[PDB]
Amino acid sequence: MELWLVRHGETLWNREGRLLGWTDLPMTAEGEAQARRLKGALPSLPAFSSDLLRARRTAELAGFSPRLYPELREIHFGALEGALWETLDPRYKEALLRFQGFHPPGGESLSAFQERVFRFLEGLKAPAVLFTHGGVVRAVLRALGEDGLVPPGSAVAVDWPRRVLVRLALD
Ligand SMILES: [Cl-]
Ligand SMILES: [Cl-]
Ligand SMILES: [Cl-]
């Protein structure tokens, strides 16, 4: 089934290289600009969005009025929230690079995160635009056997759960 996934515009922690999960940070001005650029580029489909500020504000600026769902949130990094990528212990770095066996103290395991996400996608009964986070888009792209890193404010359309349709980036 056709689905459009949107990664929210950038926040400060993106340029700072800090893990951003359930920490509810706002986007930067550039993030807001990235969200506006999406207007007129996404299809007119029912919209759903993470309840975190940066996501639904991206939804708003993109010209949508999405229903909110916590299930579309980024992974909960637990004690690793706000942690600089550079300083992460090898085990966490590798876990995130290889996207496997990630168990952050006080947070969500990558396994639990994927089940939440894939379970939400399975519940969808019709094509829709999903305003979410980098880790969610990444989970979906990798599961479809592809590189999961896309630019903030960019989008991807897939035919879940068979293949990737298009990657839309607006410079
Ligand atoms: Cl379809
Ligand atoms: Cl895991
Ligand atoms: Cl299938």
Domain count, the chain: 1
Scan for tokens 């006080």, then name that residue: 106
| Ligand nearest, relative to CA of residue 112 | 2
User: What residues make up the domain containing 32?
Assistant: 1-171
Query: Are the C-beta atoms of residues 168 and 157 closer than 8 Å to each other?
Result: yes
Q: Which residue stretches of the chain are H helix?
A: 12-16, 29-37, 53-61, 90-97, 110-123, 134-143
Adjacent-strand bridge partners of 15: none
Tokens of 45: 């489909």
* Sequence-separated (6 or more) residues with CB below 8 Å from residue 44: none
Rounded CA gap, 102 and 95, in Å? 5
One-letter amino acid for residue 95 of the chain: A
| Pairing mode, strands 2-7 and 155-159 | antiparallel
Q: Which residue stretches of 38-97 are H helix?
A: 53-61, 90-97
For residue 160, the CA-to-ligand 3 centroid distance in Å is 7
For residue 99, the CA-to-ligand 2 centroid distance in Å is 8
Q: Which residue stretches of 107-156 are H helix?
A: 110-123, 134-143
Check which CATH number belongs to the domain holding 96 and give it: 3.40.50.1240
This PDB structure is determined at a resolution in Å of 2.3
11 marked ligand binding residue: yes
Catalytic residues, by residue number, are 8, 74
The continuous run of DSSP H or E covering 5 comes out as strand 2-7
Query: What approach was used to elucidate this structure?
Result: X-ray
Scan for tokens 């009025």, then name that residue: 65
For residue 29, the CA-to-ligand 2 centroid distance in Å is 34
